[PDB]
Enzyme design. Structure first.
Site, PDB file in Angstrom:
ATOM      1  N   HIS A  65     -24.745 -54.027  -7.753  1.00 22.02           N
ATOM      2  CA  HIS A  65     -26.097 -53.927  -7.382  1.00 22.02           C
ATOM      3  C   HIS A  65     -27.240 -52.972  -7.763  1.00 22.02           C
ATOM      4  CE1 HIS A  65     -29.053 -54.325  -3.745  1.00 22.02           C
ATOM      5  NE2 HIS A  65     -28.553 -53.100  -3.474  1.00 22.02           N
ATOM      6  N   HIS A  67     -30.089 -51.153  -6.730  1.00 25.10           N
ATOM      7  CA  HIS A  67     -30.450 -50.716  -5.586  1.00 25.10           C
ATOM      8  C   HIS A  67     -31.996 -50.530  -5.547  1.00 25.10           C
ATOM      9  CE1 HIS A  67     -30.137 -48.633  -1.706  1.00 25.10           C
ATOM     10  NE2 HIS A  67     -31.261 -48.259  -1.944  1.00 25.10           N
ATOM     11  N   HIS A 110     -25.006 -49.433  -8.685  1.00 24.99           N
ATOM     12  CA  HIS A 110     -23.655 -49.016  -8.064  1.00 24.99           C
ATOM     13  C   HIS A 110     -22.759 -50.273  -8.026  1.00 24.99           C
ATOM     14  CE1 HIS A 110     -24.586 -49.935  -3.810  1.00 24.99           C
ATOM     15  NE2 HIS A 110     -25.911 -49.401  -4.063  1.00 24.99           N
ATOM     16  N   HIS A 112     -20.749 -52.801  -5.927  1.00 22.78           N
ATOM     17  CA  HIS A 112     -21.105 -53.334  -4.303  1.00 22.78           C
ATOM     18  C   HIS A 112     -19.741 -54.292  -3.890  1.00 22.78           C
ATOM     19  CE1 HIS A 112     -23.202 -53.965  -0.594  1.00 22.78           C
ATOM     20  NE2 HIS A 112     -24.210 -53.623  -1.310  1.00 22.78           N
ATOM     21  N   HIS A 397     -26.971 -42.337  10.497  1.00 24.78           N
ATOM     22  CA  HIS A 397     -26.514 -43.459   9.543  1.00 24.78           C
ATOM     23  C   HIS A 397     -27.966 -43.716   8.859  1.00 24.78           C
ATOM     24  CE1 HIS A 397     -22.948 -44.076  11.649  1.00 24.78           C
ATOM     25  NE2 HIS A 397     -23.654 -43.949  12.931  1.00 24.78           N
ATOM     26  N   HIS A 400     -29.948 -49.535   5.241  1.00 21.25           N
ATOM     27  CA  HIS A 400     -30.512 -50.061   4.244  1.00 21.25           C
ATOM     28  C   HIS A 400     -30.689 -51.492   3.935  1.00 21.25           C
ATOM     29  CE1 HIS A 400     -31.555 -50.891  -0.310  1.00 21.25           C
ATOM     30  NE2 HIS A 400     -30.288 -51.367  -0.375  1.00 21.25           N
ATOM     31  N   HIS A 402     -31.529 -54.797   1.557  1.00 22.96           N
ATOM     32  CA  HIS A 402     -31.692 -55.484   0.220  1.00 22.96           C
ATOM     33  C   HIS A 402     -32.861 -56.505   0.253  1.00 22.96           C
ATOM     34  CE1 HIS A 402     -27.275 -55.239  -1.422  1.00 22.96           C
ATOM     35  NE2 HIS A 402     -27.393 -54.434  -0.366  1.00 22.96           N
ATOM     36  N   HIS A 452     -27.395 -52.960   5.959  1.00 19.91           N
ATOM     37  CA  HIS A 452     -26.062 -52.275   6.354  1.00 19.91           C
ATOM     38  C   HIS A 452     -26.352 -50.713   6.342  1.00 19.91           C
ATOM     39  CE1 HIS A 452     -25.169 -51.228   1.907  1.00 19.91           C
ATOM     40  NE2 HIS A 452     -25.692 -52.169   1.726  1.00 19.91           N
ATOM     41  N   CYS A 453     -25.582 -49.813   6.980  1.00 20.10           N
ATOM     42  CA  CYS A 453     -25.401 -48.133   6.754  1.00 20.10           C
ATOM     43  C   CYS A 453     -24.923 -48.180   5.269  1.00 20.10           C
ATOM     44  CB  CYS A 453     -24.396 -47.774   7.613  1.00 20.10           C
ATOM     45  SG  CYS A 453     -24.305 -46.183   7.591  1.00 20.10           S
ATOM     46  N   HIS A 454     -25.633 -47.241   4.561  1.00 15.57           N
ATOM     47  CA  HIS A 454     -25.283 -46.854   3.277  1.00 15.57           C
ATOM     48  C   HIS A 454     -24.229 -45.997   3.150  1.00 15.57           C
ATOM     49  CE1 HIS A 454     -25.572 -47.308  -0.857  1.00 15.57           C
ATOM     50  NE2 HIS A 454     -26.696 -48.170  -1.074  1.00 15.57           N
ATOM     51  N   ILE A 455     -23.743 -45.349   4.188  1.00 16.19           N
ATOM     52  CA  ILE A 455     -22.300 -44.508   4.341  1.00 16.19           C
ATOM     53  C   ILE A 455     -21.315 -45.648   3.791  1.00 16.19           C
ATOM     54  CG2 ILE A 455     -20.786 -43.257   5.458  1.00 16.19           C
ATOM     55  CD1 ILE A 455     -23.243 -42.029   7.023  1.00 16.19           C
ATOM     56  N   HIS A 458     -18.748 -46.707   6.196  1.00 12.11           N
ATOM     57  CA  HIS A 458     -18.999 -47.420   7.637  1.00 12.11           C
ATOM     58  C   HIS A 458     -19.281 -48.882   6.956  1.00 12.11           C
ATOM     59  CE1 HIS A 458     -20.553 -43.355   9.339  1.00 12.11           C
ATOM     60  NE2 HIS A 458     -19.375 -43.451   8.825  1.00 12.11           N
ATOM     61  N   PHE A 463     -20.010 -51.989   9.461  1.00 11.00           N
ATOM     62  CA  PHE A 463     -21.524 -51.795   9.877  1.00 11.00           C
ATOM     63  C   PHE A 463     -22.540 -52.552   8.900  1.00 11.00           C
ATOM     64  CE2 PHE A 463     -23.613 -47.960  12.016  1.00 11.00           C
ATOM     65  CZ  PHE A 463     -24.054 -48.715  13.028  1.00 11.00           C
TER      66      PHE A 463
HETATM   67 CU   LIG Z   1     -23.126 -45.213   9.020  1.00  5.48          CU
HETATM   68 CU   LIG Z   2     -27.336 -48.997  -2.676  1.00 10.52          CU
HETATM   69 CU   LIG Z   3     -29.552 -52.322  -2.077  1.00  9.79          CU
HETATM   70 CU   LIG Z   4     -25.879 -53.279   0.001  1.00 15.63          CU
END
Ligand SMILES: [Cu+2]
Ligand SMILES: [Cu+2]
Ligand SMILES: [Cu+2]
Ligand SMILES: [Cu+2]
Ligand SMILES: *[C@@H]1O[C@H](CO)[C@@H](O[C@@H]2O[C@H](CO)[C@@H](O[C@@H]3O[C@H](CO)[C@@H](O)[C@H](O)[C@@H]3O)[C@H](O)[C@H]2NC(C)=O)[C@H](O)[C@H]1NC(C)=O
Ligand SMILES: *[C@@H]1O[C@H](CO)[C@@H](O[C@@H]2O[C@H](CO)[C@@H](O[C@@H]3O[C@H](CO)[C@@H](O)[C@H](O)[C@@H]3O)[C@H](O)[C@H]2NC(C)=O)[C@H](O)[C@H]1NC(C)=O
Ligand code: NA
Length: 499
Positions: A65, A67, A110, A112, A397, A400, A402, A452-455, A458, A463
């Site tokens: 992905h 980002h 990164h 994905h 949290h 993010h 897309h 989604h949460c980017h941790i 998670h 999440f």
């Molecule tokens: Cu999170």
């Molecule tokens: Cu990302």
């Molecule tokens: Cu993204």
């Molecule tokens: Cu994503």
């Protein structure tokens, strides 16, 4: 050297020791972080990704992905596994061929797939502006001015319990740092500046989890960009940066020639700086080659506060100036129990058929889409509001979206919304108990967009939800190349899956 906008990118396994401890990794371009991919605004990027992975302990499939890049008309190139594509299998390659109209700033790339990016597949992605409105604020902006902040684990990602509080073993600044336990005096990164020059430092969080308190002893930092969006100048002495966020700041090399600590304190793992953990070195040309002797203050007098940020351009806010003042006002119920996260009562588990391929095969409402209850349709050409009230365990949290950036109408730790001039960005901390962080955007980009949460731990624990934006126009807006159509047959054949 930077690579791109047209380049091959090989994804390999190798041993690395960024904190003195050797472990195998998943690498782009043979390094951690991966090489910087770069071009100019509006360029055609064609990143031909060669999957050369063979170690099953970190997964031999992959997907990448880009980002923060909107992918308008190229949803198929976005990268999230089982949302926009099936993974690329080992021994195969795939050309991510897209354009970056109307964007310029600091991004990253990164893996994905699952938690694979934690195992090393992460690098910077910079889209330069030849007519940058901020150009006159600095002298130097190049590969030497990119600063990455990363969490690093001694345990391989596929051995991290799902839904657990997973803690790192080192902070890496530009790929180097020291381990929190069994600390050894392994090499620290050096960022070199010339007395009197001004630098556009591009600060990128490539974290899988922690947020960092980032500062430079003796220096302050003038923010000019937030997640790709140009800002008014804001001078701070500390930046709390959450996973996946980016800032550009001007560093004025205006202190005495010498050595200064660069500090990145994570919210979990090792606290402080004993033994040179959580540290890198700012070295002026002509300084002695030795560690800094500088101190942090006890408290930082001008920390970044998100509501202080404002766009350089007159971006405004879409919709009307009150809660619910949008064509499609949503409130997500964000929860955690028993090791799994949920959104609106449903924990995300990736489907067998990617969401985009389900839509191209004719599924055309969100109740026909899998996973059931994990896909929300959005109407076209409409103002969307999404309230993200915090409280779920494991915060704060960083959410993010897309395909989009968004106005941050309400930020963490402040109950007052801003319908006039908030910053726009792509990843936002939703704060703490009782907060009501809220985002707005307009739907002008048909396709399925992950939220989604980017941790990353998670996300793996569920999440996430998919916004199926403008389902009726997805197929006409996003013509797909044969190589994309070939991915799911190849993947399913290799894994003995029937569909
Ligand atoms: Cu999170
Ligand atoms: Cu990302
Ligand atoms: Cu993204
Ligand atoms: Cu994503
Ligand atoms: C965060 O802000 C959102 C708005 O952006 C708040 O949403 C509002 O939530 C209340 C319930 O908490 C909603 O009112 C309820 O509606 C149902 C009917 O669907 C009714 O049965 C209940 O008696 C009550 O009227 C409201 O529709 C919704 N949207 C608004 C006001 O625009 C949310 O409560 C805020 N969360 C936090 C934690 O502050
Ligand atoms: C909590 O968030 C709110 C909303 O983002 C922040 O409120 C905003 O505070 C700014 C800065 O003081 C106000 O702007 C100022 O307006 C005055 C009066 O017109 C003008 O003279 C100044 O040049 C400056 O622009 C802004 O109006 C206000 N917005 C709202 C909707 O209240 C607030 O500062 C944040 N709290 C903390 C502790 O940072
Ligand atoms: Na407006």
């Amino acid at each position: 050297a930077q690579i791109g906008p047209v380049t091959d990118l090989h994804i390999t396994n190798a041993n690395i020791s960024p904190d003195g401890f050797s472990r195998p990794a998943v690498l782009a371009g043979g390094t951690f972080p991966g090489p910087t991919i770069a071009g100019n605004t509006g360029d055609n990027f064609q990143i031909t990704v060669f999957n050369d992975l063979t170690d099953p302990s970190m997964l031999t499939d992959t997907s990448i992905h880009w980002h923060g890049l909107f992918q308008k008309g190229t949803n198929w190139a976005d990268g999230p596994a089982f949302v926009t594509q099936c993974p690329i299998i080992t021994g195969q390659s795939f050309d991510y061929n897209f354009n970056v109209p109307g964007q310029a700033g600091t991004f990253w790339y990164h893996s994905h797939l699952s938690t694979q990016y934690c195992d090393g597949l992460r690098g910077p992605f910079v889209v330069y502006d030849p007519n940058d409105p901020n150009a006159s604020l600095y002298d130097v902006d190049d590969d030497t001015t990119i600063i990455t902040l990363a969490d690093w684990y001694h345990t391989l990602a596929q051995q991290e319990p799902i839904g657990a509080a997973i803690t790192a073993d080192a902070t890496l600044i530009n790929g180097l740092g020291r381990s929190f336990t069994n600390t050894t005096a392994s090499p620290l990164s050096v960022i070199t500046v010339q007395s009197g020059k001004r630098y556009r430092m591009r600060l990128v969080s490539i974290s899988c989890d922690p947020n960092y308190l980032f500062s430079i002893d003796g220096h302050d930092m003038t923010i000019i960009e937030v997640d790709g969006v140009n800002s008014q100048q804001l001078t701070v002495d500390q930046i709390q940066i959450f996973a996946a966020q980016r800032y550009s700041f001007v560093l004025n090399a205006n202190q005495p020639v010498g050595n200064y600590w660069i500090r990145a304190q994570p919210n979990s793992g090792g606290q402080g700086f004993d033994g040179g953990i959580n540290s890198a070195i700012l070295r002026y040309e002509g300084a002695t080659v030795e560690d800094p002797t500088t101190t942090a203050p006890t408290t930082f007098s001008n920390p970044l506060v998100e509501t202080d940020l404002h766009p350089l351009a007159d971006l405004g806010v879409p919709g009307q100036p009150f809660r619910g003042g949008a064509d499609d006002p949503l409130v997500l119920n964000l929860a955690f129990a028993n090791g799994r996260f949920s959104i609106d009562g449903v924990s995300f588990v990736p489907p067998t058929v990617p969401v985009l391929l389900q839509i191209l095969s004719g599924a055309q409402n969100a109740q026909d889409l899998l996973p059931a209850g994990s896909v929300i349709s959005l109407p076209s050409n409409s103002v969307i509001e999404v309230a993200l009230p915090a409280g779920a365990a494991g915060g704060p949290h960083p959410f993010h979206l897309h395909g989009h950036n968004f106005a941050v109408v309400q930020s963490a730790n402040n109950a007052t919304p801003n319908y006039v001039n908030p910053i726009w960005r792509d990843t936002v901390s939703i704060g703490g108990t009782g907060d009501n962080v809220t985002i707005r955007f307009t739907t002008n980009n048909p396709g399925p967009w992950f939220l989604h949460c980017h941790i990353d731990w998670h996300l793996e624990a569920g999440f996430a939800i998919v916004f199926a934006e403008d389902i009726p126009d997805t197929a006409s807006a996003n013509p797909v190349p044969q190589a994309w159509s070939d991915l799911c047959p190849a993947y399913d054949q290799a894994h003995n899956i029937s569909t």
